[PDB]
């Protein structure tokens, strides 16, 4: 039997950074779990268990720590430096993944160097360099929402297994997971996060929604609208069912007011808005969630 | 061998529950996790099978949807309905156990119907009824806290087994789980929550911190002596660490700016703070985080 | 106002341990989560930030480091080891809680020093020391057990918010946690921990069930029934909810077949079994599942 | 500005499926954890709300548990009957992804319809159809496997960043996450997940590891070279670091006998093991580990 080596990459994951920025008495805190994956030449070291390729996961560690000690403007730009460095810096590293999740703190009634975590959001970045190209993926994930009326759910075809009942009034509730790939790297990514993240509230509290399916096309369709630096937005939105509870055998109704939250299952609805024309199919949505 | 039945509770956990006020177009959302469990005469149900004084959980659940019909003022006051509900509505049922957790939910701007969770902290209460006694602990969990200075710790005893280097400058970083026992059922519950809240994080970040004991401390304190409807809180809190990363190895030194942040082990710093003269250890913390 | 401290404990919780042992070819694996949490005179650190009497957490962390280089039988020999250790050697600590869970790992086709996780079962030892006295409660959680029939629930009371219909066959599924207070240290720890799982077990795969407050006391009634060492077991046991799915929509039947496996809500089923005239309240119950 | 759906697909995620099999004394356990997801002509749903394709996801889910009444040999051939079924019956469906988690159960002391939760491993399966074309891709995941010896690392390169000590004798601790694509459907699925299970395990177990890479190799080889059926295996290993504790200062020596097992950062290393002349790339790894 020929056995060969396809799709690898390896290297150290969830390294957990805080960095304090203290130049004045006014701290701010940075908070990111970063991991970081090369590519290349890794045949040996399969094969044979040869490491003369293998920079250690170890040593990527502490180049996380090192290179924080400088500062970084933004997340993005702290795992373009890291990119930049393993692949330059090492002649069969040809490529590889960068990816953080940046954690929120606000301060406690702003104080100097007092803070609360802000739990409610979680800011994503996934960099990929191949060759000369590098790559930018920003995201939200764990943004929770729910509009109490304004929603419908009609007009879908029944077949022997369909029993669902049609409304004209229910509860939409989803946990916003959505990441955004930039054409290019030179972007305020502070400023754009910001903005992305007004426009795909907005755009999911203001919509009439007769379905999750066009609730997300227009959170994308705003976002596309608004930011030339990106080419496209993928959503992946749960909805997070919220049943009309039964209280007639008790003797009352229920004018849509109590409602059970169930766990599982639920509608998972996922779906790509990209700028008419741009590339179809770029090769970081293949490891964007994961290697397998 | 002579066997014997002892303390038991039964009943319905994590009842999901969201509850929308929508008499006018200004949406309003309770949103609650809800466990009833009943104290009593069980014995021949363990004993014998003899299911006649079981209520059944099912029972207990549907009482939790048909109340919620009616609507209720705060989290405190549904669950003051439910036990009384339990311990009058059955002879031989002498008390029990309700808990609730509240979910905090905020406008998107300002949207009569669209909502986001608040993720970064979770109100919780839990009411015990003994007889005629009735006891309530409202709480907070979740919400966690960072000081980047101000944080000191030295003086400690250094045996066979220390390591460990004294410091004046460090970060304190803590998840807050904090919990306070009424000592009557007339209380604004929503405004005391707030006012707690405030104490707590005001506390934590303006106390220049020698010992995690002393911050917890002076949080107590703080809440004890603005609120004399409550005679004592109990307090949990990781230090969770964050530990000055060496960068000497690299050409480079640390000024309190680049740290890791670890998962485990982290240290447990457990204390109540109560009112001098009030009950030394009430029945209702004994099963206050959990049966077994 | 007049504040006071009252109960309190602190430690390093969680420290994590992996003992090898390798003096022959055939290596053994010992692997711990472990928690430990002074108790004493406190009294200064918490009013003052006086740290002369404050144990640091990092030294009880390299203490359980230690110690555990010189090897342990079991669990709750190395719990007592180090709760007597701190106990005695300082004179301000009274007593303290010292816990641990023990992972269990197989080996891979019985090899000499290659293992895989037994993930269906954590062992569990809680440690209370209060002055002379030793309090062990070994338990077990994690444990997810099922039966497919032979369970019954009928004969319950029936109110307004009453709908649950009586059934003859149902499932039956719940997770074990279980824990038991043994009344002296002088105990064969392994092998009782092996005997009582096989008697919960057994209990609750051939009771013929009327509830599952009869199921789980004829389990904990075997556990007192065969070990005159330990004076009650207390279980929470989860019933995690098969509901039987209408299939009649689709013109099928459904003859106990084909289930929904809810998550939330679930009945929780807790109880006591003791040694008739054995204490009712021991003090370690009070912090068993946490401080608050 | 011009805005285009791109990629996209809808379904019902994690509906809990318990069949039981009880034509006979002794009963069968299938415990199932399945997500139905659909691809198509889905455009006007996006653009307009217009709902005429949309197979609700409440008809997926009742499909399952309709479907699951006739019994099911295997869970890929469950999933294979599904998405038949979805892609025949709607024209404007093109194809979709189906997926189910297994898990697994053993009998209590080999009783007929009485088991306890195998929670050691959960098996995978994800199968999607594009046209008249169809691939199913097995897996395992969460199978916690530890050498204690017989794992090494030296000779690698060692940058201005690098302070980790080469090595000959170390603990090597993975979670084996492993997924492999057939050419075919017209297998035993069982008997072939438990041989891949076996064969991974062994080598895992029997490789001298000079490196994961290499022992990650080593297991995709034992499988492609015995499994003419599969064309492919992925596999996600973290090394899962297990620190030997410096007791030094405690004047004690380590012989490779105590050790801190960290949560995080920890190794991530990624490879796919090919048969030589397949596919190099197959577009359901695209999606494998989710949609974003």
Redesign the interface.
């Known amino acids: 039997?020929?056995?060969?080596?396809?799709?690898?990459?390896?290297?150290?994951?969830?390294?957990?950074?805080?960095?304090?920025?203290?130049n004045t008495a006014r701290?701010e805190?940075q908070?990111l779990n970063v991991?970081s994956?090369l590519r290349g030449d890794?045949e040996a070291?399969?094969?044979?268990?040869?490491?003369?390729?293998?920079?250690?996961?170890?040593?990527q560690?502490?180049?996380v720590?090192?290179f924080?000690?400088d500062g970084f403007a933004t997340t993005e730009e702290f795992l373009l430096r890291l990119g930049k460095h393993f692949t330059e810096?090492?002649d069969w590293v040809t490529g590889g993944r960068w990816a953080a999740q940046q954690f929120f703190?606000?301060r406690?009634?702003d104080?100097d160097?007092?803070?609360?975590?802000?739990?409610?959001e979680v800011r994503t970045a996934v960099l990929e360099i191949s060759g000369s190209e590098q790559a930018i993926v920003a995201?939200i994930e764990?943004?929770?929402?729910?509009?109490?009326?304004?929603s419908e759910?009609?007009?879908?075809?029944?077949?022997?297994?369909?029993?669902?009942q049609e409304t004209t009034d229910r509860?939409l509730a989803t946990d916003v997971?959505?990441?955004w790939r930039y054409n290019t790297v030179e972007v305020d990514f502070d400023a754009v996060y910001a903005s992305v993240r007004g426009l795909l509230?907005?755009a999911?509290?203001?919509t009439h929604?007769?379905?999750l399916?066009?609730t997300?096309?227009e959170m994308?369709?705003a976002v596309?609208?608004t930011h030339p630096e990106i080419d496209?937005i993928?959503?992946?939105l749960?909805?997070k069912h919220?049943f009309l509870?039964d209280?007639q055998?008790?003797?009352?109704?229920?004018?849509?007011?109590?409602?059970?939250?169930?766990?599982?299952?639920?509608?998972?609805?996922?779906?790509?808005?990209?700028?008419?024309?741009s590339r179809?199919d770029h090769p970081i949505?293949?490891?964007?969630?994961?290697?397998?």
């Open positions: 039997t020929c056995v060969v080596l396809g799709q690898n990459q390896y290297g150290k994951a969830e390294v957990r950074l805080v960095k304090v920025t203290r701290h805190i908070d991991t994956q890794f070291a399969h094969t044979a268990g040869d490491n003369a390729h293998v920079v250690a996961t170890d040593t560690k502490n180049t720590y090192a924080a000690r810096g090492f703190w606000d406690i009634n104080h160097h007092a803070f609360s975590r802000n739990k409610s995201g764990g943004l929770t929402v729910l509009k109490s009326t304004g759910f009609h007009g879908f075809p029944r077949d022997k297994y369909t029993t669902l509860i997971s959505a990441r509230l907005k999911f509290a203001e929604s007769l379905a399916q066009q997300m096309y994308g369709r596309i609208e496209e993928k959503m992946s749960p909805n919220h509870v209280l055998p008790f003797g009352q109704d229920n004018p849509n007011e109590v409602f059970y939250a169930a766990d599982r299952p639920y509608g998972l609805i996922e779906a790509t808005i990209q700028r008419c024309g179809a949505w293949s490891n964007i969630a994961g290697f397998c």
